[PDB]
A paper describes a structure:
All NESs also participate in hydrogen bonding with Lys568 of HsCRM1, and mutagenic/structural analysis identifies Lys568 as a selectivity filter that blocks binding of non-NES peptides.
Histone deacetylase 5 (HDAC5NES: 1082EAETVSAMALLSVG1095) and Paxillin (PaxNES: 264RELDELMASLSDFKFMAQ281) have NESs with non-α-helical class 1b pattern (Ф1XXФ2XXФ3XФ4), but the peptides bind according to the class 1a pattern instead. The 310 helix favorably presents Φ1 and Φ2 into the CRM1 groove and natural class 1b NESs are likely to bind similarly. Class 1 NESs are helix-strand peptides with either α-helices (class 1a, 1c) or 310 helices (class 1b). (A–E) FMRPNES (light orange), SMAD4NES (salmon), HDACNES (slate), PaxNES (pale cyan) and FMRP-1bNES (deep teal) bound to the ScCRM1 groove. Because most previously studied NESs have substantial helical content, we also study five NESs that match class 2 (Ф1XФ2XXФ3XФ4) and class 1b (Ф1XXФ2XXФ3XФ4) patterns, where the hydrophobic residue positions do not suggest an amphipathic helix.
Author numbering:
A (entry chain B): 63 to 68, 78 to 199
B (entry chain D): 11 to 20
C (entry chain A): 9 to 186, 190 to 216
D (entry chain C): 0 to 376, 414 to 439, 461 to 1053
The structure:
Amino acid sequence: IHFEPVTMEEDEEVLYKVRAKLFRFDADAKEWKERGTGDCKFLKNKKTNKVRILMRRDKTLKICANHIIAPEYTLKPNVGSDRSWVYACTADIAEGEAEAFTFAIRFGSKENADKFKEEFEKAQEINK
Amino acid sequence: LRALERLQID
Amino acid sequence: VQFKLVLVGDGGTGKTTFVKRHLTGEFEKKYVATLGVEVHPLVFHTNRGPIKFNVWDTAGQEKFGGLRDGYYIQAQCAIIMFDVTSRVTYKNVPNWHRDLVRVCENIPIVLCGNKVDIKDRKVKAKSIVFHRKKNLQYYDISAKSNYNFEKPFLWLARKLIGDPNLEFVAMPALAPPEDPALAAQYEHDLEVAQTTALPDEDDDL
Amino acid sequence: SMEGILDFSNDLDIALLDQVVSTFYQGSGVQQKQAQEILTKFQDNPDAWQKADQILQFSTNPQSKFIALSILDKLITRKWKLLPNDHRIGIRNFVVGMIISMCQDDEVFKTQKNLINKSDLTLVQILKQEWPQNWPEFIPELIGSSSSSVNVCENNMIVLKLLSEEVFDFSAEQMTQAKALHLKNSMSKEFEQIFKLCFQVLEQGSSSSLIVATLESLLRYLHWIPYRYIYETNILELLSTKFMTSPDTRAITLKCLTEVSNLKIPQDNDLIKRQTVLFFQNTLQQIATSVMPVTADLKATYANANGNDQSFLQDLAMFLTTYLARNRALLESDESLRELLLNAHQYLIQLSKIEERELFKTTLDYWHNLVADLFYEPLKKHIYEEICSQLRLVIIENMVRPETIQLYKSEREVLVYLTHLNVIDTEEIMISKLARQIDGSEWSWHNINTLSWAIGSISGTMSEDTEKRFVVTVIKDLLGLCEQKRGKDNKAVVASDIMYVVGQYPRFLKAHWNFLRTVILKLFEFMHETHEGVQDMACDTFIKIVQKCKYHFVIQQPRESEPFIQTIIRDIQKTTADLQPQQVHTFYKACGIIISEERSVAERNRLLSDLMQLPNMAWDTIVEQSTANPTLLLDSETVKIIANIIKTNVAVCTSMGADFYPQLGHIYYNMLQLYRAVSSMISAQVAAEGLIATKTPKVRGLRTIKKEILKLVETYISKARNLDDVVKVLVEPLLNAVLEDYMNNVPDARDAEVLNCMTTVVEKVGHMIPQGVILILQSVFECTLDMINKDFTEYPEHRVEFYKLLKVINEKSFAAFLELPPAAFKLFVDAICWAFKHNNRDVEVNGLQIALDLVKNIERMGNVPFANEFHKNYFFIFVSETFFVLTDSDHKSGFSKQALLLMKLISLVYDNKISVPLYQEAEVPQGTSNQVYLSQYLANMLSNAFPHLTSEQIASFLSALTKQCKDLVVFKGTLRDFLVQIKEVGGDPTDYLFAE
Ligand SMILES: Nc1nc2c(ncn2[C@@H]2O[C@H](COP(=O)(O)OP(=O)(O)NP(=O)(O)O)[C@@H](O)[C@H]2O)c(=O)[nH]1
Ligand SMILES: [Mg+2]
């Protein structure tokens, strides 16, 4: 006898994941400002094979970086750090309309920073 | 507790 | 779906820095005294939908007090802030609480001791008991280290919505989009950005 | 457009007001912001209070009438007595009238509670000014108007609540001592009449809103009224029965009974004892029948968060703990009260299971009170056996991570007591919990840690034979549990917990050498495990065991050929090969703890030599090739190697202190040469690249070297026992290596650690090197002062260390300031006062102490020219600078030490400790006493700084102040009275006779 009983990134693949702190440059104040600390993920869309950076803040999970790893971008060192990269971004959509930024991302060690440049350049080719 | 010597993490 | 939050406490306790961290993620090192009040909408994504806080960040310095208890009219929730490195700021918690519950007789209130990142802490855990008889939630927080920085809003969201299982959840991450007359413009801004040292280079991140 | 209300030549357009107000409260963005600035400028107009009657009459906006009352509040509290007596009577009348008219319109009474509460508080401000001397009929007329209207009677309860709060709860800071006593006396005189009204309302009333507001006011009365009003009336019966049944009144009634549990009560009247038992009996009865039985799952109820359940359970916890901490003995001897006693504690057991950190802390504090009492009080513990048995399980299951430090120590204390009270029950609970980890029924990462912490926390409570059987059984079961699992993650947790328990039972380790050996060798094996956390666990456990068991590493054990420390040192390279540098330093530090247990000098120094063999060879190499070509120091790898060598020396020196001296001498002279070479490179790099060079990894790496060298020297000197060698071997090379380098570097390249290092040198050997202290001041004083005297913000580290150094120099080698050129001694005084004005507590507190200590140094010099010149030059600078921070409202954190310094300054003159006149021959008749001149200087100073005070106020304040300059507590009250009076106009000068 039968008794009756009682995000938006699921189409992507995580190529690289690393903990980091992200800064944005306020040129009008010649001052770096923190934007978020959390996991930085290189996400590969299965239906286009395009790779983006997606980064969320801990606890609140709010997006602090969402943009394509464009092949034109270039990772530059910052004068006061051997574990960070600086680079300009022309279209980030973490906070609404696509906007341009000079970003800086820092990691826990120079090792993680270099590996990030590895993966970041690998991903740059994937986007071509 | 000489079985401590065989304590392994694997 | 928005709720008025008033934020009160002594000058220098970190009220504006705490809100700013939530608004932009930045940590402001400078102390620029709030004048009267600053209102900032703050939205959180929950499994019950987005909840909007209209934060009234009031001034703690008396000579900048502005409308004082007039800022509390029709608040639906509140945060009282003090500084665990300054006893006087905790001694003044009952005065802010008095001025607050005279205007706002039954609202969820969070008591926050800020700056627990500083080694030489002066208001010891065991001395903090004012919240017990006043039915306030209490949290140690640090706007600098982000220790417990989300707890005051999570607890208030739960009280205001009436769901003790409400959780923060990940906002959906849309696919991001894809001229030569600005290559030299971004090169100027980039040369400056590289030669401005990153702050707090001794932090783990 | 909105800025029109700010024009007072024209009438006030109420409609423009209500639009500005609305744009602020309901508006948004720029419009809201603009209206805010307007409303603040309007409210801050010193004439705006005149237009308050217009708003209260012809506005329709309650927010605007609220702002009107705020403008009035400012005026009543700050300027009342300056008004023509006409306005005072007028304002009073149309505040009284506005309140009556709001209470009579049941519609307004219902919907404008915020505006009515504000009006009540505004009325209460008037009472603080005018009542009872100019209003003796207020209370009788309030009691009369209560019977004519429920809404007015309810609102009179709110007026009295606020009055009680303003007079008894919040007067200490806001009124003078005299004015507070006057109002407390006045309310006390007429309370009989107030209590009558309050008790009638409670016994007869049926309007719950009226009831609740009466009980709200009662809560305030219980802070101060005499007990007879509570125990000689029926009111306990009402509170503990009638008002516990209605959920409306239940929350307020419970808080009232909590306060009643704190009344000042004679502890020898048997009837009052029965009354205290009875109202507890009733309250528990109402809870069991109207709220929930003692079996209810309060954890689940709290988690559901229906209605006000969470607040109610908090308030019940506070009630039960408050009452039982004071009165449980009342229930412990009468057999008819046993059920009541144990039901009350069973509710606390259930409350203690709620998941809510702060509530758990409240109940945990009570449990501490109880189990401490059962531990000492004869014949009590058997009463509570079943309560305590449940508590053991609650505390074990909610154990928090040790090292939330405070909560763990409180949990440990209660559990240690509970173990003494029944060891057998405790042991059985812990073993049982352990089986349900093995059998998987309660297995989890969280649950196995919680239990290991609990087992670890009771170390020292069992007998050594029971402990021995217990420890064995625990490890045995744990080992089998680790085997039982798979995957690094699982096996990692169990293996860690195993080491945690072991680390907590040193008495067992000391008696089982072979076991201790096996432990350590396993930690060593784990120092090669790359799984996240294993290595940190291995090192922390190693040093923790060493701090406790060091003697067993330094003697030769039976069946061993050498002390085990030698076996650790031999394989140290292998043991630590995979550790990160931080972890290596902990290891070396742990070895230094063992080596300091060896009291034979020759063997201790040999062990020291062998331990430092690897860093000393890497050191010799580097010093050889570092000096060859100073290029290497640009190699980040050599810089990292150097800093890690120094850090290893700091770690070992931290363990060994005075014993570390031989190793210091092996590196000291070359280390100071290295300090200089690194210094040149930093300077050379800042020249070639600019100040931005200080932010680069290379320079930060070089500065790290300098900092660790200073930390090493500081660490040794702060612990040295042979100070002859410190002075005659260490100090001179050190000063030559660091002082000039600091003085002659640009501000952004000076290390504040140099200051901290010098503070220690002065601390331990300052008395022996007066020429060295002078050299220190010469090299750091002026150039550091110029860094920190432009704002309160820049160079925060230099700021703090600067005043720590001046403080210690002022204590230990005050002669150095005597030798300063007069220009530089004046900068020293300027620098002390600069410190006064910081809000940074680190700086402010040392600035006041230096000022105090300096005055004492000067006083001890006697009647000599330098002391006489000091008072002539600087006495009044210190009196007036101290008065400034006392009265400016931005340095309240330093009141006490400002008061002390001020009391010392004033006492010098009223004890005739100052030999020369403090004035000019000209400006005062010959022969005038410094006492008279001081009182004149201060009267003039305060008259210009606080021109709104009367001459009489100032004169009474100074007479009181100087009279009381030997009684710090009274002196401080007079200062606080003064701080109240400068906030208003018209302060009563007789207030300053309060002490008299
Ligand atoms: N170390 C530390 N500093 C903090 C923290 N939070 C704020 N601060 C600092 O404390 C100072 C005061 O910050 P602020 O937000 O302006 O305090 P406030 O309560 O808004 N003051 P006001 O009432 O006058 O507006 C700032 O220097 C800020 O960087 C913290 O969590 N940790
Ligand atoms: Mg602010």
